[PDB]
């Protein structure tokens, strides 16, 4: 039990460890007796499980590599020095997003006051909280249905071959 609970960095429940051990033992016995590497289907029919389960059990049991294993022949580099930080803020992307944010407001500027206001409140560009139609209509006092229609006309205007060019590139 202790070896099942304190033997892997990424812990696995007891039953899954038992299944892994059973599969490994069966594979070893098949390899020894038959003289070749068993195929996934052979183990699947021997273990009475689908091949997908067999490959999943094979995958779960692997041991993580170490980031400190040296790969430099002279002994200076490490395996972990060549891993790229994928979730790293790329300055080009950040500047592109900032430019998009600044350009979006200008296109709304040419629209009428009510149109830009209702669009901003609905999509929460100014504050980030998308308010409900009743909330938007409370400020101007117009009806819910009016808020429904006024928004649609703005989308039709922007989704036209007259103001799309300024915003086509960013998509």
């Amino acid at each position: 039990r202790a070896m099942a609970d304190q033997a892997r960095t990424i812990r696995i429940p007891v039953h899954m460890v038992e299944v892994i051990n059973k599969l490994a033992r069966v594979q070893r016995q098949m390899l020894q007796d038959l003289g070749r590497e068993p195929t996934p289907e052979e183990l699947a029919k021997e273990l009475d499980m689908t091949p997908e389960k067999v490959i999943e059990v094979q995958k779960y049991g692997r041991e993580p590599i170490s980031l400190h294993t040296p790969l430099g022949e002279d002994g200076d580099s490490e395996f972990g020095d060549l891993i790229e930080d994928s979730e790293a803020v790329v300055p080009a992307d950040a500047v592109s997003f900032t430019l998009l944010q600044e350009q979006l407001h200008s296109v709304l500027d040419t629209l009428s006051e009510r149109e830009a206001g209702v669009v901003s409140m609905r999509f929460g560009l100014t504050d980030g909280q998308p308010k409900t139609l009743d909330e938007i209509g409370k400020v101007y006092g117009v009806t819910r249905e009016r808020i429904r229609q006024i928004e649609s006309k703005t989308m039709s205007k922007l989704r036209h071959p007259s103001r799309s060019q300024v915003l086509r590139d960013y998509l």
Binding site: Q6, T9, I10, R11, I12, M16, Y60, G128
Partner: protein, 97 residues
């Protein structure tokens, strides 16, 4: 924050009080990450209630999920809504028997 302000850099001998004043919580299990969900395990070496959230402006369970809730301790899980870079700055501690 400003290098110009740095006047001196002192070293010392950390005592128990300092060691548990740095820490944001005790680590009391040897687990790191779930083998199926691949998310940090509670009270493990990678816990989020101690070392901070792993998603910008989000908590573990997910009730609070945007910037508007900033600096709020979720009662369901205890994680505070803040950036994920704070995982580079928060320590823990182990209480030896």
């Amino acid at each position: 924050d400003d290098v110009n302000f740095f006047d001196e850099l002192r070293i010392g001998l950390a005592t128990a009080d300092d060691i548990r004043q740095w820490s944001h919580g005790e680590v009391k299990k040897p687990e790191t990450i779930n083998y199926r969900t691949l998310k940090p395990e509670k009270d493990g070496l990678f816990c989020e209630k101690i070392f901070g959230p792993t998603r910008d402006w989000e908590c573990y369970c997910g009730k609070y999920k945007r910037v508007r809730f900033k600096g709020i301790i979720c009662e369901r899980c205890g994680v505070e809504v803040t950036r994920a870079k704070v995982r580079r700055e928060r320590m823990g501690h182990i209480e030896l028997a």
